[PDB]
Design a protein around this ligand. Structure first.
Ligand code: FAD
Ligand code: FAD
Ligand code: FAD
Lengths: 488, 488, 229
């Protein structure tokens, strides 16, 4: 009867499509359609393709315990053509799913509704990604927001609480699937399967593990999120990043549980902990704002993403790119984070800006280049949230970061790594370098470098580009462009 | 009335010199004289000096809490001169110390007995370092043993047990040492103090911390020592070696405590833990055999340390020695250990075997060179134990490891690092390189090394010397040695 | 069913005064079940089924008082209208003081006085004993419960007394008395509930700890027990 099309909602609790299908009293055939062609320049990354295949086996297993025969998988270039073909093979009547908000799916989903309606298929879509739908939170004249702070304080004073999480189906039944076939999906190239598996050193994909990770954060570092959310020298944030991107954990459940944690701490006199949930929900809201900006202000051609630096003189140097990729830049905090990114497919937010601010404001390479690297090497590679994060560091929108300006590495280090233990852990070569110089070894006296057994150029690289030579280049590249700006 | 001379017994429990000075009735003057010039080539190295500076401060407070004015710190180039100034300055009747067994101390300390007995000082020396005195354990003709197995088998069958650890003094009486001055000792170059202090990230020198590390190992990884002692990818061993080198812990307490754990485990059916104690005591007996070797068959001139490798034509190549120290050899298990030795001052025994075997089998550099580096970088740098280790890995002992032979790095990897997690912890560059090639990257196909993001020669070095070249040069060097040896 | 460990949630007074949501408990427990089911923990999965049933008994207590209320045409214990009760204030005093001589009953009557709470099966034991052995007006015991229970709940107390007296068709048989060893083996198999609340009988073996009157004098003398002093 009903077909539940899974996309980025790989979970059973608070899955409205699945919950609505199970409650209809009929039969529920779960399925996943692999159609990466439909995402064009946003073909899923290398490590994201690995997570999905881990998550699907996880979800299939949990579906079968609930009574399903299997998770049905179909491979086609067009979602609809596969979704139609499925309910033909099954004789289904409905197709439920949860709607997404990226500019690709907003259009592909919409065409599926009409295409499937034409063929006689009852179709309904449900919200599962967001606290509130974007077209619910507007300014007092009813028009979309354009800065984060007024948007989030309206979400936080919204007249009704976000919907509490739905219960998983107690059982689902799908009938006979022995003729209903599934073609094995291929998410990894044979020559990379081994290198991919090592991602499991740091991540176990699956809704269960998302649940356990959330429980761990709530009982652990959440209380100290107010004073430590910027630190990268410890596990200070939730590490729910890739789980939330694949809908393995309901943000609405996160919201309700955190809000109730706030109430208990307030009543316990734990003001710092109370303050901590405030900021952690703000981090959840940034993910809301991620979909807000893509629903209201999507970008294709007149203001595409990073349109303001259309006229920037990018350093086209594939050599420098490779040195950034391999963490051989000579800037420790940059090199440390670049190792971890390749190692564990994840990076702390503040380190996400350090290696990104550096990529466009020091080496000054095409921001579109480091974007495609993040897309290939982040497990939580998220279309809208990646968009927001780059727009933030490049200064592409009023909330963003100041453009003609380069962070002093010791500023970064002091905020994100007071004792230099983060880069000592990822760059054991620098382990003996005292904390004072650990983020800027090139300014250290040769007597100190040798006492730590460091020899810049042979033991640990020399700074590929110097800061002075880079802010200089920054002025020469920005006014050249503002000169190009006022000339058209 | 009695001087207690500390040397490598910086503890207060089971310290027969200090415990007999206190029970004599009179006062006790506890002191330490820093006479390194007497140690010739075995002058304490950089990081071993950093340990004594903390261990002595730590032993000072211990002594002061037991009713002492201070630990008198004297400086000299001759220990007798400084010791008999102190017997005068502080006016004592006796001088008590616990006797060591290295070739330096054995004859320096009998020059002190006579030197001090000529100015009327009574001297007594005690056992503080061995379960049994070297002369106490012999074979059936009364001769020293020449291999470790018959020797340790004898100690385990000695007619009496190792003496039970003595209690510390109830308190010690020093009198007024407000008169007696102490020389501010210098253990650290100003230039090195900032990198020496980072050794505290991993270690805390002191009688008190030695005691906590023992009960940590006894109640923890001792039960699995039988099966995990060879692995360097977990904390499988006691991490007691620097504590035991400086005598901050009784080996007679360790023996007695471990024998009690065994009796209990045997009564609990824990047969694998019972063998764990058998094997860990054997490791304590290897330390006994290191003293037994330096006392019964000392370095002579008629036959030196590595005497079997006299005509061995060593590769002399300072470039190779630099790559080895920096852990850029291109052999991951070796590089990983050379990085950890520099960063923490310690190496698992089997990684010591790997890095030192690589030194004299693949690079084939003078073993002296590596023996000296070890002396400057190890916190537990121990004269007899270092001699025994290098003698073992080069095949000077009949017990020792074969000469005409090189280990396959996969043999080393599977025994000491089966999942490659030791390499990945210390060389994050190779985190995404599969276990199947992580210990010999040069053999991997380009596709597999490109999937792992490794470019051999830029991202991680190439093999500085290839195995087949190393084996060919080893047979050419030994044949050169064996045609030379017969020519005499 | 065991009263010799903390086997239950100890949530009843909290739930009587509404200090906890039963809809949160339902939802939280249903989530624990889904996880345990995915972990192969089949015995824990049935634990949630059975604990929700206990939450549903509280639902049924309200469902009964709303749909079939106490009337005058037919009251609470209406099936025991012509039951000739023993009227004996002396017996009621011994029952309150836990000096009945039945150890499982005395142990519970001591704990009810000391903590204001009783495991559900010890409630069944002390109340069944009240109307089956002493056969005192159930009203009397219903009132004492009301003064001593922290979770004294109108509909739940009515349902419990209706259950143990057999006014419900669901309820427990009328013409029948439990063997105290049947109660002991189900709710206190090792006698550790009796021994915690009646230390006098600590050295009395499990085999007779729930019916001391049946033990030989030698066995009661070994246990240091003189039945009557
Ligand atoms: C250049 C750049 C690229 C980024 N790319 C991604 C991406 O591909 N996917 C992604 O999920 N996040 C992305 N972020 C946001 C942020 O870096 C990560 O969400 C966060 O570091 C993940 O760690 P966490 O889950 O422990 O965060 P927490 O501190 O635990 O935050 C809780 C959750 O809130 C969300 N969140 C927090 N901060 C942000 C933020 N600034 N923007 C959007 N969502 C946020 C995430 O879902 C996160 O899991 C990017 C940020 C930058 C600056
Ligand atoms: C080339 C080479 C050099 C070495 N240099 C040293 C050195 O400078 N100092 C040193 O203490 N050991 C040395 N060893 C021995 C061995 O590597 C260390 O004793 C061990 O790694 C210390 O770690 P642990 O305390 O966890 O040992 P455990 O396995 O926990 O053993 C407990 C104790 O037994 C003793 N012990 C164990 N193995 C040996 C051994 N082979 N020889 C002597 N005593 C042993 C140590 O006191 C050690 O603390 C060397 C070995 C080799 C092959
Ligand atoms: C004679 C008699 C009198 C009783 N009087 C009361 C009373 O005054 N108040 C009261 O709350 N319960 C009463 N009960 C029901 C039962 O004994 C208690 O609910 C239970 O002992 C409370 O312990 P608990 O919270 O650990 O229960 P759990 O086993 O942890 O059960 C969880 C919750 O379910 C509910 N519940 C469980 N069993 C029942 C039941 N049989 N009927 C109704 N709700 C139930 C309670 O809210 C309880 O807190 C009575 C039972 C009997 C036989």
């Amino acid at each position: 009867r009903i077909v539940v099309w899974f996309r980025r909602d790989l979970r059973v609790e608070d899955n409205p499509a699945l919950a609505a299908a199970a409650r209809a009293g009929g039969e529920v055939v779960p399925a996943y359609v692999w159609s990466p062609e439909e995402e064009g320049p946003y073909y899923p990354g290398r490590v994201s393709r690995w997570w999905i295949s881990q998550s699907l086996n996880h979800l299939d297993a949990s579906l079968r315990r609930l009574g399903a025969g299997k998770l049905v998988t179909r491979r086609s270039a067009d979602a609809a053509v596969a979704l139609l073909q499925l309910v033909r093979d099954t004789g289904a009547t409905h197709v439920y799913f949860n709607h997404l908000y990226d500019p690709i799916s907003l259009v592909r989903d919409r065409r599926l509704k009409e295409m499937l309606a034409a063929e006689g298929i009852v179709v309904q879509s449900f919200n599962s990604d967001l606290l509130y739908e974007p077209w619910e939170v507007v300014d007092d004249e009813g028009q979309p927001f354009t800065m984060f702070d007024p948007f989030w304080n309206r979400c936080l004073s919204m007249p009704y609480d976000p919907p509490a999480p739905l219960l998983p189906p107690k059982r689902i039944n799908s009938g006979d699937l022995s003729m209903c076939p599934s073609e094995d999906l291929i998410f990894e190239d044979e020559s990379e399967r081994g290198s991919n598996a090592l991602l499991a050193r740091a991540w176990t994909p699956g809704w269960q593990n998302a649940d356990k990770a959330l429980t761990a954060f709530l009982n652990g570092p959440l209380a100290d999120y107010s004073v430590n959310r910027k630190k990268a020298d410890s596990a200070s944030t939730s590490l729910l990043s890739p789980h939330l991107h694949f809908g393995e954990l309901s943000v609405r459940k996160v919201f309700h549980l955190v809000r109730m944690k706030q109430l208990v701490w307030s009543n316990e006199g734990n003001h710092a902990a109370e303050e901590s949930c405030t900021l952690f929900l703000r981090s959840i809201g940034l993910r809301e704002y991620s979909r807000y900006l893509s629903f209201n202000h999507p970008s294709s051609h007149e203001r595409p993403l990073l349109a303001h630096l259309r006229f920037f003189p990018w350093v086209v140097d594939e050599s420098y790119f490779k040195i950034w990729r391999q963490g051989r830049t000579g800037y420790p905090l940059v090199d440390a984070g670049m190792r971890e990114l390749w190692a564990t497919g994840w990076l702390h937010d503040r380190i996400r800006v350090v290696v990104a601010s550096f990529f466009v404001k020091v080496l000054q390479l095409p921001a579109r280049w480091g974007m495609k690297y993040f897309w290939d090497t982040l497990l939580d590679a998220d279309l809208e949230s990646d968009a927001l994060g780059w727009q933030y560091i490049t200064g592409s929108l009023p909330d963003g970061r100041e453009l003609d300006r380069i962070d002093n590495p010791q500023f970064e280090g002091y905020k994100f790594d007071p004792h230099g233990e983060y880069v000592r852990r990822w760059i054991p070569e620098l382990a003996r370098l005292p904390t004072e110089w650990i983020h800027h070894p090139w300014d250290a006296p040769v007597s100190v470098l040798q006492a730590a057994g460091i020899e810049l150029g042979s033991n640990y690289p020399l700074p590929i580009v110097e800061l002075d030579a880079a802010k200089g280049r920054l002025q020469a590249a920005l006014s050249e462009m503002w000169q190009l700006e006022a000339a058209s």
